[PDB]
Amino acid sequence: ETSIPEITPFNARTSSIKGKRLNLLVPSINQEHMFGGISTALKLFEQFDNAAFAKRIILTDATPNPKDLQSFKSFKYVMPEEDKDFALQIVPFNDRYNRTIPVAKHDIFIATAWWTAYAAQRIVSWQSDTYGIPPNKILYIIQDFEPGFYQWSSQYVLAESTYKYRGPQIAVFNSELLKQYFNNKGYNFTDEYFFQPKINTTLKNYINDKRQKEKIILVYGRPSVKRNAFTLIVEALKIFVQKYDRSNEWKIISVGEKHKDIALGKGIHLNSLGKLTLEDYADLLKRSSIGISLMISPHPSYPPLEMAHFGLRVITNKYENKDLSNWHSNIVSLEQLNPENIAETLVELCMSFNKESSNMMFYINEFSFIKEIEEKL
Amino acid sequence: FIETSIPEITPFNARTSSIKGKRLNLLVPSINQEHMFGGISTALKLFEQFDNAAFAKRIILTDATPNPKDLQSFKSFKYVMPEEDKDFALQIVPFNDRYNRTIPVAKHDIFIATAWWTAYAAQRIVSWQSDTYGIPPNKILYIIQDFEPGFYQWSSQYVLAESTYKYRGPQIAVFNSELLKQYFNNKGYNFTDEYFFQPKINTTLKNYINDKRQKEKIILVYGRPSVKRNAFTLIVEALKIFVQKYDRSNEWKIISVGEKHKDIALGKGIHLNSLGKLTLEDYADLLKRSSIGISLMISPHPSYPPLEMAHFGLRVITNKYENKDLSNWHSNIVSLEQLNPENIAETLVELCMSFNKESSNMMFYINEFNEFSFIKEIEEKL
Ligand SMILES: Cc1cn([C@H]2C[C@H](O)[C@@H](COP(=O)(O)OP(=O)(O)O[C@H]3O[C@@H](C)[C@H](O)[C@@H](O)[C@H]3O)O2)c(=O)[nH]c1=O
Numbered sequence: 001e002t003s004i005p006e007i008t009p010f011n012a013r014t015s016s017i018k019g020k021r022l023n024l025l026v027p028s029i030n031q032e033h034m035f036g037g038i039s040t041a042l043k044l045f046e047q048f049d050n051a052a053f054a055k056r057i058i059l060t061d062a063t064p065n066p067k068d069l070q071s072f073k074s075f076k077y078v079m080p081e082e083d084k085d086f087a088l089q090i091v092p093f094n095d096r097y098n099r100t101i102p103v104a105k106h107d108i109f110i111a112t113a114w115w116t117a118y119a120a121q122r123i124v125s126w127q128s129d130t131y132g133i134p135p136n137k138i139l140y141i142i143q144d145f146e147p148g149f150y151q152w153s154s155q156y157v158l159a160e161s162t163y164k165y166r167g168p169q170i171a172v173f174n175s176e177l178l179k180q181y182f183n184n185k186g187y188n189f190t191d192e193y194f195f196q197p198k199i200n201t202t203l204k205n206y207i208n209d210k211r212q213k214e215k216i217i218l219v220y221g222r223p224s225v226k227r228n229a230f231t232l233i234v235e236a237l238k239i240f241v242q243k244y245d246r247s248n249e250w251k252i253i254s255v256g257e258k259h260k261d262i263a264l265g266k267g268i269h270l271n272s273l274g275k276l277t278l279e280d281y282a283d284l285l286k287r288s289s290i291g292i293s294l295m296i297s298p299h300p301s302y303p304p305l306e307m308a309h310f311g312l313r314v315i316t317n318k319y320e321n322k323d324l325s326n327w328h329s330n331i332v333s334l335e336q337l338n339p340e341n342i343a344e345t346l347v348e349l350c351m352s353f354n355k356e357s358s359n360m361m362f363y364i365n366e367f368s369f370i371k372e373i374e375e376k377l
Numbered sequence: 378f379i380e381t382s383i384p385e386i387t388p389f390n391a392r393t394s395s396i397k398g399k400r401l402n403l404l405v406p407s408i409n410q411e412h413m414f415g416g417i418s419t420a421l422k423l424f425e426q427f428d429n430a431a432f433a434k435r436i437i438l439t440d441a442t443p444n445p446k447d448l449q450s451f452k453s454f455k456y457v458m459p460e461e462d463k464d465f466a467l468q469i470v471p472f473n474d475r476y477n478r479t480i481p482v483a484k485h486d487i488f489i490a491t492a493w494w495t496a497y498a499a500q501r502i503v504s505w506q507s508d509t510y511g512i513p514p515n516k517i518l519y520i521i522q523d524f525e526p527g528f529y530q531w532s533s534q535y536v537l538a539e540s541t542y543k544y545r546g547p548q549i550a551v552f553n554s555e556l557l558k559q560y561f562n563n564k565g566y567n568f569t570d571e572y573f574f575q576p577k578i579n580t581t582l583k584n585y586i587n588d589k590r591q592k593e594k595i596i597l598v599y600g601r602p603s604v605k606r607n608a609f610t611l612i613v614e615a616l617k618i619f620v621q622k623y624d625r626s627n628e629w630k631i632i633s634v635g636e637k638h639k640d641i642a643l644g645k646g647i648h649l650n651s652l653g654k655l656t657l658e659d660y661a662d663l664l665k666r667s668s669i670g671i672s673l674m675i676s677p678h679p680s681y682p683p684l685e686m687a688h689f690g691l692r693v694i695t696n697k698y699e700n701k702d703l704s705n706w707h708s709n710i711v712s713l714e715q716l717n718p719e720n721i722a723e724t725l726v727e728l729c730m731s732f733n734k735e736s737s738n739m740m741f742y743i744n745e746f747n748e749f750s751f752i753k754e755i756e757e758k759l
């Protein structure tokens with residue numbers, strides 16, 4: 001590799017549109033990708049007043065198929081080469097070489113993934129030079145410390161450089177933990193907001209159901225998402241199956257992402273259910289007694305919180321300022337993260353099988369800042 | 378296919394041994410010449426310091442077995458198989474193929490770790506050792522060359538690598554550079570004791586530092602595509618912008634050294650020319666002729682080329698990282714805080730224009746000696 005794909009030029013051209021317009025830069029809107037923070041960004045973008053703002057979604061990585069656009073029926077699907085002034089508009093711009101998109105004088109950009117912010121910050125500079133205006137504010141939806149997605153390398157510093165941008169920029173952090181993490185590292189933004197995690201609305205409908213706990217160890221297994229430390233969990237399970245003589249009493253199930261069943265020893269297997277419907281997931285939560293969900297990141301992630309609120313004893317990990325142990329009594333937070341400790345803790349929890357306290361009420365009781373932000377654009 | 382296990386932490390099985398003297402055991406991935414770079418050479422240099430009169434010495438290879446040629450650099454060492462249990466004073470044991478095999482570990486075997494997975498194993502051997510021989514845990518000596526979790530994205534490897542720093546048993550850290558030490562201190566890591574050795578100019582290079590210099594319009598680039606910390610692709614992108622925005626760029630030669638790669642077209646018929654890894658002599662000559670340098674190190678560690686370039690009269694572009702800012706180490710060093718292609722290009726244009734040394738606050742780099750003056754103080758603790 002001699003070049004860096006993520007930062008392929010994001011060419012713009014002038015447009016005669018005169019109203020204020022919000023532009024959401026997202027990698028994709030396909031259902032296949034409608035998870036992570038792409039759905040959260042779309043939820044937040046939905047909040048902005050379509051009465052005071054035209055809305056255009058710019059796809060930077062993946063083009064949709066007819067099916068995907070069904071979720072955006074009110075949106076006019078338009079090519080980069082056209083320059084329509086619709087109120088709602090979707091433009092595919094993943095294939096950018098020698099092509100450009102019409103950027104208006106008062107186009108405001110909302111970034112998501114770090115490379116979308118990277119591009120936005122360069123479009124803003126082009127914009128102010130072209131139209132002879134002071135730089136407009138960028139809205140930056142920060143889902144995680146994205147440099148952490150890479151080892152120390154080019155991508156790492158490029159991703160981080162988007163946080164060191166000195167132009168007008170408003171950060172909206174996913175979770176307060178993430179915000180405080182950024183504050184500690186000394187990053188600066190024109191303004192800072194955040195939205196706290198909130199229990200999945202479907203799941204909340206089952207949180208009061210009666211629970212018939214079984215001897216089930218529920219694992220959040222996502223081999224493809226390194227932050228979830230799938231391989232570390234497997235290694236821990238293997239030691240657990242070997243050192244714990246009552247392990248045969250337990251079922252060990254994996255949910256989140258489909259993978260092959262994994263032999264742990266003693267004929268015991270890690271059984272993958274892949275990604276269940278929220279309904280089935282809810283049912284499985286009610287029956288399960290122990291949970292394992294790791295998140296190598298200041299962000300808390302959702303499954304640990306969901307598991308705790310369904311009466312599971314949950315094994316999770318500290319990271320810097322994050323320690324979920326004081327969020328909820330059901331949460332067990334390991335500081336030393338290795339297979340042996342997870343196994344050991346797991347044996348303790350199993351033995352204790354023969355809820356209580358919560359300091360995260362906000363979770364079951366969020367974009368109230370949207371309007372305060374609308375006044376700033 | 379899907380990785381279900383973690384290769385770096387394959388079990389490091391030990392068995393009891395009757396050897397009774399004190400013995401130092403160096404855990405290194407390899408001693409092959411092909412790998413005799415990075416910190417493997419530094420660890421061997423430091424291990425060389427320990428008094429062979431007071432200590433038996435065994436080197437345990439954890440990743441790569443040598444070939445007859447490689448062992449030529451260790452002629453005084455008896456090359457022995459894991460299955461044998463000899464009490465030689467100097468010994469090398471290959472232990473990269475470990476499954477169903479063991480290595481004899483004596484009551485008073487002391488371990489010196491290098492790469493994080495070697496420390497990971499050492500810490501587990503120590504536990505096995507104290508249980509087996511009914512003794513309190515022995516001290517581990519940990520030679521820390523960098524914040525090795527940084528070698529990975531947030532993941533299993535990351536936390537495993539870091540877990541070696543959170544080990545609560547007796548452990549002495551020897552940091553490569555004070556910057557690295559302070560970096561660890563800031564993150565709040567704890568060790569039984571802390572030492573460090575400051576960077577010292579390559580002895581061969583020092584022989585040329587006083588030669589007369591005939592500076593040419595050469596931009597010298599530390600290019601190592603395989604070492605991500607050196608941000609090779611970031612540099613290339615920066616060069617491309619530089620070639621496009623700078624109208625006097627045709628006046629300059631742009632050369633890459635460190636690791637062999639194909640020549641890279643930057644535009645305007647200009648190419649990044651790779652010389653691969655030069656001999657220290659040729660490297661020295663090239664340094665004397667060059668006027669501008671680019672050397673990046675995404676890590677608290679300063680790395681050597683930026684320092685070498687500065688002391689040969691080059692204006693050097695490098696990067697800040699956390700507590701590291703080499704700009705106040707030496708006047709020839711230009712440190713960028715915002716690290717992107719545009720800024721590197723812009724800075725590069727400034728430096729070229731200024732072409733139409735002075736101040737140093739890192740004298741330690743070309744002075745004294747005895748950078749391992751702590752060795753004997755450490756020997757008293759084992
Ligand atoms: C393990 C599992 C999770 N899930 C859902 C429930 C979890 O909340 C969600 C976690 O996936 P993530 O990509 O980490 O986050 P997410 O963005 O998909 O989920 C979030 O959606 C928001 C709208 C809600 O307000 C949040 O509470 C949260 O549910 O996945 C399933 O549908 N089936 C499963 O088997």
Ligand SMILES: Cc1cn([C@H]2C[C@H](O)[C@@H](COP(=O)(O)OP(=O)(O)O[C@H]3O[C@@H](C)[C@H](O)[C@@H](O)[C@H]3O)O2)c(=O)[nH]c1=O
Nearest residue numbers: 414415419577578579634635653654655656657660681
């Ligand atoms: C660019 C270049 C560097 N080099 C050498 C000189 C640099 O010091 C060395 C830097 O590579 P690294 O793997 O980052 O570090 P290193 O471990 O290989 O080198 C260090 O070894 C210590 C024992 C010495 O005391 C130091 O002076 C230093 O040489 O590479 C060449 O031989 N040829 C080259 O073309």
